[PDB]
């Protein structure tokens, strides 16, 4: 995406019920900070979740350590918190090369001034002034107003921790629910006229795969005829009727 938001200004979207290959980014390797939390990064294309919400924002290149489950900082206390046992993966890499220009990218900001801690997955957008004691301002920016949004500056000349990083937050949950987005599944081709194991969409067996003579009806997958002799299976790719012996 050519346009992002600040870490306090992050957006929440949701992708459900399709195919998403996540490990295809491995050999793509536009990475700096490949990391998952609490789950193995391999089998995300194998098994999958519901409530597969997604986030995206910009982070200055030094506070990347603060994205850690429970570990506080500029981000987890004041900008965006991920809880103890953050179900998800967070992978970061540089965005100086497009989401930064000369003179400083003074468009993204960060919240610093807030009384208390944040929530899991919290969008802490507000228009509130700070107070360290008991006496607030009268509107004009002074000694304890503390407009919490100080402008991030991203020049093409800064250090190594002073660069904008593209980073996403994979907001995941586990509620017993209909099954949304998973990885695309390895549809290896068929074989005919040989005793062979197979595994179709869930159900499986082992025998030969040959043609038929009889037709199906437009919602059929597999046919059993006498006492679950599941023999007449239409193939899921070519949508043509086959037989199992």
């Amino acid at each position, epitope marked *: 995406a050519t346009r992002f938001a600040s870490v306090y200004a992050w957006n929440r979207k949701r992708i459900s019920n399709c195919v998403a290959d996540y490990s295809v980014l491995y050999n793509s390797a536009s990475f700096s900070t490949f990391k998952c939390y609490g789950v193995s990064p391999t089998k995300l294309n194998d098994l999958c979740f519901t409530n597969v919400y997604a986030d995206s924002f910009v982070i200055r290149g030094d506070e990347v350590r603060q994205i850690a489950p429970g570990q506080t900082g500029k981000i987890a206390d004041y900008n965006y918190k991920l809880p103890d046992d953050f179900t998800g993966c967070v992978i970061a890499w540089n965005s100086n090369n497009l989401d930064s220009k000369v003179g400083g990218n003074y468009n993204y900001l960060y919240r610093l001034f807030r009384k208390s801690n944040l929530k899991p997955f919290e969008r802490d957008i507000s228009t509130e002034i700070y107070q*360290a*004691g*008991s*006496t*607030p301002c*009268n*509107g*004009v*920016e*002074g*000694f*304890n107003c*503390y407009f919490p949004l100080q402008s991030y500056g991203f020049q093409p000349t800064n250090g190594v921790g002073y660069q904008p990083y593209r980073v996403v937050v994979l907001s995941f949950e586990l509620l017993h629910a209909p099954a949304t987005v998973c990885g695309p599944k390895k549809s290896t081709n068929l074989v005919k006229n040989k005793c062979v194991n197979f595994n179709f969409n869930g159900l499986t067996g082992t025998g030969v795969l040959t043609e038929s003579n009889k037709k199906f009806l437009p919602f059929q997958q597999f046919g059993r005829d006498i006492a679950d002799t599941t023999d007449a299976v239409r193939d899921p790719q070519t949508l043509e009727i086959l037989d199992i012996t």
Partner: antibody, heavy 127, light 111 residues
Framework: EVQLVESGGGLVQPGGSLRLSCAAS????????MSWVRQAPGKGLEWVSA???????YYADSVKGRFTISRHNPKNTLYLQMNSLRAEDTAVYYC?????????????????????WGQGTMVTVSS | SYELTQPASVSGSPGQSITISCTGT?????????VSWYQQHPGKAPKLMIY???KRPSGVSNRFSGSKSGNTASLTISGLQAEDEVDYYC??????????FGGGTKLTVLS
């Protein structure tokens, strides 16, 4: 080298101008809160202006529109251009660094002090 | 033009207590914790003694202490010395990011 340098005052007609130069030392005005203090010698202290770190210029009542404050972030000098001079401007002009949380002596709370001081200048406004 | 209201002269004994007030308005003292007190030698600049009204600075002599009660503030001074007889002023956050200074308090040292 904590130092404030107020000078440049002299013979200015009522109806003219004079630009001071508070050479701030020991810190930078690019990241510290600043203010001016005017005072007839021995009389009461009288506040003038507040430019903040990052050039947000705030004034007092009488000097609102009259005095003109300016700085230079590498040069570290607090200037006081002065238009619409009155006969009550017989006063020694002290620049004084305002203490906020970006001032190095306050962690939490309120700040609000002047710790580093100078000598004052003698801007005489008389016919 | 725009100052803070004080009695111009108080007096006390060495080793005893005295309280110098700082009465302002409903926009400078009664809504901000920044009645700060300075130490001006006549002919010199002021000198930082009291700021952040209830808090005490680092290593500075404990003979000055400020307190704020509504609109009328105070400078609870304990233990006068010979080095307390200069021009004294209170400074307040005068609202809308403006500032204000005192009307002067000339502490006359006895004995």
């Amino acid at each position: 080298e904590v130092q404030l340098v107020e000078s440049g005052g002299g013979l200015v007609q009522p109806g003219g101008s004079l630009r001071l130069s508070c050479a701030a030392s020991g810190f930078t005005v690019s990241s510290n809160y600043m203010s001016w203090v005017r005072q007839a010698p021995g009389k009461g202290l009288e506040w003038v202006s507040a430019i903040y770190s990052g050039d947000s210029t705030y004034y007092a009542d009488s000097v609102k529109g009259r005095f003109t404050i300016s700085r230079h972030n590498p040069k570290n000098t607090l200037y006081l251009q002065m238009n619409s001079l009155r006969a009550e401007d017989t006063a020694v002009y002290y620049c004084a660094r305002l203490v906020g949380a970006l001032t190095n002596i306050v962690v939490s709370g309120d700040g609000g002090a002047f710790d580093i001081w100078g000598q004052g200048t003698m801007v005489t406004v008389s016919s | 033009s725009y100052e803070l209201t004080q009695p111009a002269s108080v007096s006390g004994s060495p080793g005893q207590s005295i309280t110098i007030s700082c009465t302002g308005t409903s926009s400078d003292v009664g809504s901000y914790n920044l009645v700060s007190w300075y130490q001006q030698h006549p002919g010199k600049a002021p000198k930082l003694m009291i700021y952040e009204v209830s808090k005490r600075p680092s290593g500075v002599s404990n003979r000055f202490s400020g307190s704020k009660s509504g609109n009328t503030a105070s400078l609870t001074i304990s233990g006068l010395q010979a080095e307390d007889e200069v021009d004294y002023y209170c400074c307040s956050y005068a609202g809308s990011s403006t500032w204000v200074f005192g009307g002067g308090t000339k502490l006359t040292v006895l004995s």
